[PDB]
Design a protein around this nucleic acid. Structure first.
Ligand SMILES: [Mg+2]
Ligand SMILES: [Mg+2]
Ligand SMILES: [Mg+2]
Ligand SMILES: [Mg+2]
Ligand SMILES: [Mg+2]
Ligand SMILES: [Mg+2]
Ligand SMILES: [Mg+2]
Ligand SMILES: [Mg+2]
Ligand SMILES: [Mg+2]
Ligand SMILES: [Mg+2]
Ligand SMILES: [Mg+2]
Ligand SMILES: [Mg+2]
Ligand SMILES: [Mg+2]
Ligand SMILES: [Mg+2]
Ligand SMILES: [Mg+2]
Ligand SMILES: [Mg+2]
Ligand SMILES: [Mg+2]
Ligand SMILES: [Mg+2]
Ligand SMILES: [Mg+2]
Ligand SMILES: [Mg+2]
Ligand SMILES: [Mg+2]
Ligand SMILES: [Mg+2]
Ligand SMILES: [Mg+2]
Lengths: 144, 79, 65, 126, 132, 195, 251
RNA sequence: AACGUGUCGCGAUGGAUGACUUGGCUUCCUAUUCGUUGAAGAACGCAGUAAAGUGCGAUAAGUGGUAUCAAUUGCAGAA
RNA sequence: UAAGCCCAAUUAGUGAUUGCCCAUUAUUCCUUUGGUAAGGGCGGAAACUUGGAGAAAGUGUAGCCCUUCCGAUGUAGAUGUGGCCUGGAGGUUAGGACGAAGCUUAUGGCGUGAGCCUAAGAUGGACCGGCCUCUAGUGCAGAUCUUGGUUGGCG
RNA sequence: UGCAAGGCCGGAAAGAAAUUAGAGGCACCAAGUGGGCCUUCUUCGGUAAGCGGAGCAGGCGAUGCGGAAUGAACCGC
RNA sequence: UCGAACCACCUAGUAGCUGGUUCACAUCGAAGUUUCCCUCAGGAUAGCUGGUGCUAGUAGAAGUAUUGUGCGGUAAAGC
RNA sequence: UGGAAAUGGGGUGCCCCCACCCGUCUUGAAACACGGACCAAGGAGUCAAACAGACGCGCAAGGGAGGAGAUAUCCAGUACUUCUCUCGUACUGAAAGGGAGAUGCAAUGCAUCUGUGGUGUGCACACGUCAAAUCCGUUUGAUUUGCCCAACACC
RNA sequence: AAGUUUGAAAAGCACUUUGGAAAGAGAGUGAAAUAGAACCUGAAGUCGUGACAAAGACAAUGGAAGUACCUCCAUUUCAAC
């Protein structure tokens, strides 16, 4: 939409909102991010505090697949057991059998108290996670 | 599941009838009992009654001052 | 060209906002430790008391209702 | 067919023309506000021509009232007359200068038969 | 001015605009609806040409490699010499009756070929191969 | 007539910029009620409707449960269950397995929040259906729902100012943690400062 | 992409009593020393020469394309919304109209006309061919010479009987399988008196679902929840229970 | 008074505007890519009457083949 | 023997006030407009003649209707407008050889204005208006602007 | 033990610092501006200035109206 | 055309510099100062200002006085 | 007045008295500062991307695709789509890596819901208060929603 | 640069006579020649002559406020408010 613009709204204003003293120029405060340490240093040091440095060691060939560890908490396990799959979790005394990596979620983090007793099968599991489940009628199982 | 006060929020701005000609906001309504474009005078939306000699009906009887003229039209013009 | 003119009248347009009262940002922090390490432990007990005082309430308010 | 009563006094009659409008056969008799920094009109000297204020607004009770009472309403065909006939005291039709002659007679016939005043007519019959 | 904006990093400094001087280096997909129709028209027209053969060949299940995907199964190209030998078919003759052959896969786990060796003899069951 | 009273005018949001035809019905409902009644509720529930969409923060059923459990612990224990009104909309909470039979009145519900209520034993209402039950809003527990912790509100600030735990606008999360955000890069943004 | 820039001109310099713009170079020709490739000048480059990598096509969330088609059919069952928005349904026997699916059987159209009199929906069909006029204003020189109204569309379950109805002017032919907004609500106005062959309501419960079940085809799509069920917000502001707690007046 | 104004009617110049649009531009698509067997290019030519252009090459505004039917058209001429 | 200067005066030592003239100030009166400023109605009744305490549940208008308070200048700038306008699209309503666009104006009117509508053309000859959305190559007096044309100086 | 101290606390407490009480508090986004000048009061530098540099407030800029014949600034407003 | 020719192209070269930047009304409405900058014809940052607000707000109000209670070393004075 | 006046308009001229050429840079423009014969048509914040804020809408611990296919249809559109990806529900460390419920007994164990206090809508509570009558303005307890401040715990 | 885009049709002004012939005046064509090939519309600008307030210059213009006279412009009354 071009009618929904202010230099179309402010025809006849003679400056489209850029003033008479300081005339709208082309690039006049540097061009780009220029001057981050010279004349825009007060902007960078103050809205971008950590910019302009080096830190840590270099990981040359970084592959995000071997460094892939999605996480789910204990209070979010119910997100993987349908009410029908939990309808068998009511009868027969059969604990739910949750398998994380099929839904994503390599690692199992222990946050909150687990609402429903189940047995999760996760590649990775926290110490407090490994302990809340095994003391809530459940069991963590390590896979892969 | 759709009442008349919702059938008026949808049409308040546009219709076959709204006939905004200048700033007048008349209406070619069935219920021309006032010719306005208000939420109470248009029987196309509601179950309301228009004002002609048959007086077709679907209160709000501004038909009083709307049928007196309707008959006096033909009288004062039959020549 | 230093002027200071119009500045006192600029500071009084949107007003020279009064200071925040003491119950704002009264973080007794960075202050002298042996005080705040005691004004800490007494907060822990006074919270165990605040939690306990609500425990009888509800339980008194249940049976006595 | 007769109007309804009003108080039709008007604030200003001389139109607001732009400034230096006569000195140039190019400018228009159509108010554009002078954006000039030191124009005498914008900074409102004495013998300068005025600038449209909110202060010139007509009385709302008599705003849009044609000198014959009868606030105006454009009419294109005889069926739009019936849509006006209920306000034939408050509104008056105005045929639209593109309605040809064959249809303009079919209207001015119906108006008198409806007492719906038209701002247009008086061809050996008003 | 600037202020509390994300440092832009826009990467449009290499004459991509097809201006009056530069030929431009932009790829606009104004033809993808024509191409979707174009391919499905070849596809549906290649299918009645190859008929009664299936348009797509047979591809095996293979395990997507990394730890992110290792639990996801996928259709790889060709089977192996192994599944074909463990199902009878000569990989020279499998590659001519719709079965797709891959002389590079290594059958690292017997688990793997077992899903595919048996997957052949499903095809080799429901295939007529009427002679010429 | 010198005043000084030029900036004391507050922006109240007279109307709504919403175009939803089912909330302009609730607004005309709650101008009638908010105007021609002595109800403190109807006043308050009317400014919250004309309020914008970013300001009507959603309350999860968790928040609704817990605060309705903090009401229902001090009642006549047989008096009534007040109606949890939220002028935003209700979202399910997979961190609350068991939900009480509480009546709720929201402009909207998640498809998983409506079923979680109705499965629990409560009935989720509307506002054309609450104007029939306590239109004055007797026995109704009006609720906002947290709008802090919102990712917009925690960029608000500078992030390079001492005592500013705001998040810089940076797509690359591992871009700006260098000089200025390190104690060993000639200055570290002072994590605390009395204000 | 090189229009209006096709000359090889350079400003003469701020030393000659003319403007400072690139001026055509040469002689004999009338363009010699004329203004070159600016907004101002003839054969002069446009401002912001339009580009084909403009954003021509929009995404729309599926749930908004469905819940726009949903709320466009809801209006096709509200005869007040159809009388407004311009469809002549004064003596239509019912809205939403439904017709016994003996219509994929019409194979000539002299009878498919005699159908539209059986419903008096030939009124909305004659307002479409009476309103056939040359377009106004450079639509006519383009390929949009004529303009009609949108007429009552006949929604089919299949594509069988489109033969008797293809040539009638007006009377859109739609398919239940793919309800098409911009036809079910053209000009952005909900309305469009529709005809709904009998075999076309069969699927609407199936292809859209109910307020409590997902559809057969729009998968995971259930009808939304009405923000207020007693949509008659006025008939409760004049209710007995509200008047009891109103605030009394005094004058 | 004359001249100079100035408003109006009528004229002249001017060629805007509108209306039209066998052109442009843009987008997409279906197939096949010149030359030593002398190409592309340009040169000169050719019509009853032809300057340009289009077409053609001393078989020259076209010859042949098929396939169509009675014109071409400024006006000769011509089954 | 001031119409100068310095002091006073203000209807003349008779009895206690404003000698007198000028403003975009003040007071008061109308009218606009904003405040979302307060209210009251927010569908049918009577004061001698009509208007409204019967015009619709409403940001915004030709305001839903009244009436009440208060403010009202302004460059850069910001913002709003049921706000103005040009080209085109999707809708709707509608004109046109019984004369459309255009064009002319001592053609009025009406809007504060942008502008709109009308009439009348010894104009024009075939297209096009209103409204809701959409859209943009959308508003020009001024750039030693660009192009075309004319003109003065000037017979 | 109890004083005193901190974080608290309930029982209890009222005024026999004027005025306006023209509503407090934050928050977000974004311009424009970043050449000022004059002036009152005082005062640094200079022979001096319609000078340069300051402090204070007011102005002009950005603003007319009224009158000092005349004047960006003075006097009223 | 020469203290670096001419043509075409890169190229619409860059310009903190100069000129211009097209409707109305309404609602408000400033700044030439702070600090930093090879900075002083420009920026960035605060202040000024607008819009949108959120919020229980006669209060955490005040370019004001009073009352108490501190502070100071200029005028005058005194050598 | 009875069929041409009377008003309103607008055209012209005149009287009175008001009024300094516009745009522009600038603290300051009538300037002896700059640009300015006239008119016509052109003529200047635009598109793309990446962001953020606001606002509109959808769904919401999920949201959404894209590419592609699939197969019904004039249809470059509309309709459908598992699959995947994407953003995020979890943060942190330079890295190896690690990874947040609360309460009571304990210094891990067992029942396993705002975490604390404070400032704090609305409603229910009783509390009286000129109060037409008794519904509401006053208020005090209860829970306090959002928000904020303080300091717990935990990663 | 340049749409000759006259008109539906060239029906493209025969012919008379003024002119040395052009051109003009007449006719005539056609719905229009006030569509006559430098042709649809035909604007602004500037100019011409006719009229006028026939005014009246002592810069133009403009502002407010009147008045003079003149305006098929609107409205209203035209046995009445
Ligand atoms: Mg600047
Ligand atoms: Mg400057
Ligand atoms: Mg394994
Ligand atoms: Mg006027
Ligand atoms: Mg959070
Ligand atoms: Mg060009
Ligand atoms: Mg070029
Ligand atoms: Mg047009
Ligand atoms: Mg043209
Ligand atoms: Mg080749
Ligand atoms: Mg040869
Ligand atoms: Mg040739
Ligand atoms: Mg265009
Ligand atoms: Mg139309
Ligand atoms: Mg342009
Ligand atoms: Mg122009
Ligand atoms: Mg000029
Ligand atoms: Mg002054
Ligand atoms: Mg003097
Ligand atoms: Mg001394
Ligand atoms: Mg400058
Ligand atoms: Mg100067
Ligand atoms: Mg509390």
């Amino acid at each position: 939409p071009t009618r929904f613009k202010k230099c179309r709204h402010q025809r006849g204003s003679t400056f489209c909102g850029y003033g008479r003293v300081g005339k709208h120029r082309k690039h006049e405060s540097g061009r780009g991010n220029a001057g981050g340490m010279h004349h825009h240093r007060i902007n960078f040091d103050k809205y971008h505090p950590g910019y302009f440095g080096k830190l840590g060691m270099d990981h040359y060939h970084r592959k995000k697949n071997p460094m892939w560890k999605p996480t789910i908490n204990l209070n979010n396990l119910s997100r993987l057991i349908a009410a029908e799959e939990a309808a068998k979790a009511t009868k027969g005394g059969t604990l739910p059998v949750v398998d994380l990596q099929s839904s994503g979620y390599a690692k199992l983090l222990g946050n909150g108290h687990i609402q429903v007793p189940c047995i999760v099968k996760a590649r990775y599991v926290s110490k407090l996670a490994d302990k809340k489940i095994r003391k809530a009628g459940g069991a963590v199982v390590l896979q892969a | 599941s759709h009442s008349v006060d919702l059938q008026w929020i949808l049409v308040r701005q546009n219709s076959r009838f709204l006939q905004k000609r200048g700033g007048i906001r008349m209406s070619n309504d069935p219920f021309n009992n006032n010719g306005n474009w208000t939420k109470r005078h248009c029987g196309f939306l509601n179950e309301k009654a228009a004002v002609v000699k048959p007086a077709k009906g679907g209160l709000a009887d501004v038909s009083f001052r709307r049928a007196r003229r309707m008959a006096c039209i033909a009288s004062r013009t039959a020549k | 060209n230093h002027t200071n003119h119009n500045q006192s009248s600029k500071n009084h347009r949107n007003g020279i906002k009064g200071p925040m009262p003491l119950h704002l940002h009264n973080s007794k922090r960075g202050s002298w430790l042996p005080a705040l390490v005691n004004a800490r432990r007494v907060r822990k007990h006074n919270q165990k008391a605040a939690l306990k005082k609500r425990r009888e309430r509800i339980a008194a308010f249940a049976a006595k209702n | 067919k007769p109007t309804v009563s009003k108080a039709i006094v008007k604030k200003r009659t001389k139109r607001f023309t732009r400034h230096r409008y006569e000195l140039f056969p190019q400018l228009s008799s159509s108010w554009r506000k002078p954006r000039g920094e030191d124009s005498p009109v914008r900074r409102r000297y004495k013998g300068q021509k005025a600038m449209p204020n909110k202060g010139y607004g007509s009385d709302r009770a008599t705003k849009y009232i044609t000198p014959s009472g009868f606030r105006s309403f454009p009419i294109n065909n005889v069926e739009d007359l019936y849509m006006l006939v209920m306000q034939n005291r408050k509104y008056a039709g105005v045929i639209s200068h593109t309605v040809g002659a064959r249809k303009r007679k079919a209207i001015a016939r119906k108006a008198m038969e409806l007492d719906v005043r038209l701002a247009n007519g008086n061809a050996k019959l008003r | 001015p600037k202020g509390n904006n994300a440092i832009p990093h826009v990467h449009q400094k290499k004459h991509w605009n097809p201006c009056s001087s530069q030929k431009g280096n932009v790829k606009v997909f104004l033809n993808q609806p024509a191409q979707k129709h174009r391919r499905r028209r070849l596809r549906l027209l290649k299918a009645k040409k190859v008929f009664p053969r299936p348009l797509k060949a047979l591809r095996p299940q293979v395990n997507c490699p990394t730890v992110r995907h290792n639990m996801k199964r996928r259709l790889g190209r060709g089977f192996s010499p192994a599944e074909l030998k463990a199902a009878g078919l000569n990989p020279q003759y499998a590659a001519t009756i719709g079965i797709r052959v891959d002389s590079r896969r290594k059958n690292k786990s017997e688990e793997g070929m077992n899903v595919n060796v048996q997957r052949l003899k499903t095809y080799m069951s429901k295939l007529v191969l009427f002679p010429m | 007539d010198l005043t000084g009273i030029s900036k004391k005018s507050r922006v109240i949001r007279h109307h709504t910029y919403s175009t939803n035809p089912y909330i302009k019905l609730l607004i005309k409902l709650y101008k009638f009620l908010a105007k021609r009644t002595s109800s403190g509720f109807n006043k308050v529930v009317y400014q919250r409707l004309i309020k914008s969409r970013s300001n009507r923060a959603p309350i999860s059923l968790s928040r609704i449960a817990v605060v309705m459990k903090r009401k229902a612990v001090f009642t006549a224990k047989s008096k009534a269950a007040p109606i949890a009104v939220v002028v935003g909309d209700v979202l399910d909470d997979v961190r609350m397995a068991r939900i009480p039979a509480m009546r709720v009145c929201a402009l909207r519900f998640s498809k998983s929040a409506r079923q979680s209520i109705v499965a629990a034993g409560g009935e989720c209402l509307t506002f054309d259906q609450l104007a029939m039950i306590a239109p004055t809003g007797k026995n109704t527990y009006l609720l906002r729902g947290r709008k802090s912790g919102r990712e917009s509100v925690r960029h608000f600030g500078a992030s390079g100012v001492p005592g500013s735990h705001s998040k810089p606008y940076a797509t690359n999360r591992g871009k700006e943690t260098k000089r200025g955000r390190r104690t060993g890069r000639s200055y570290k943004r002072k994590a605390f400062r009395h204000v | 992409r090189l229009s209006g820039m096709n000359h090889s001109a350079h400003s003469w310099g701020t030393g000659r009593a003319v403007a400072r713009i690139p001026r055509i170079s040469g002689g004999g020709t009338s363009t010699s020393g004329a203004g070159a490739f600016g907004n101002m000048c003839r054969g002069g480059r446009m401002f912001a020469p339009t580009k084909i990598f403009r954003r021509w096509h929009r995404k729309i969330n599926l749930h908004q394309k469905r819940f726009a088609v949903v709320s466009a059919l809801a209006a096709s069952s509200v005869p007040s919304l159809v009388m407004s928005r311009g469809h002549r349904i004064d003596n239509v026997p019912e809205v939403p109209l439904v017709v016994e699916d003996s219509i994929q059987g019409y194979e000539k159209t002299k009878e498919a006309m005699a159908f539209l009199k059986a419903i008096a929906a030939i009124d909305d069909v004659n307002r479409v061919n009476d309103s056939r006029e040359i377009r106004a204003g450079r639509g006519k020189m383009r390929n949009r010479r004529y303009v009609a109204r949108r007429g009552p569309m006949l929604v089919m379950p299949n594509n069988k009987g489109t033969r008797a109805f293809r040539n009638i002017f007006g009377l859109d032919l739609a398919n239940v399988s793919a309800l098409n907004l911009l036809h079910l609500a053209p000009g952005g106005h909900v309305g469009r008196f529709v005809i709904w062959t009998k075999s076309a309501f069969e699927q609407l419960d199936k292809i859209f679902g109910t307020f409590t079940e997902a559809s057969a085809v729009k998968k995971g799509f259930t009808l939304p929840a009405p923000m207020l069920t007693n949509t008659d917000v006025t008939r409760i502001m004049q209710s007995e229970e509200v008047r009891r707690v109103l605030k009394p007046k005094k004058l």
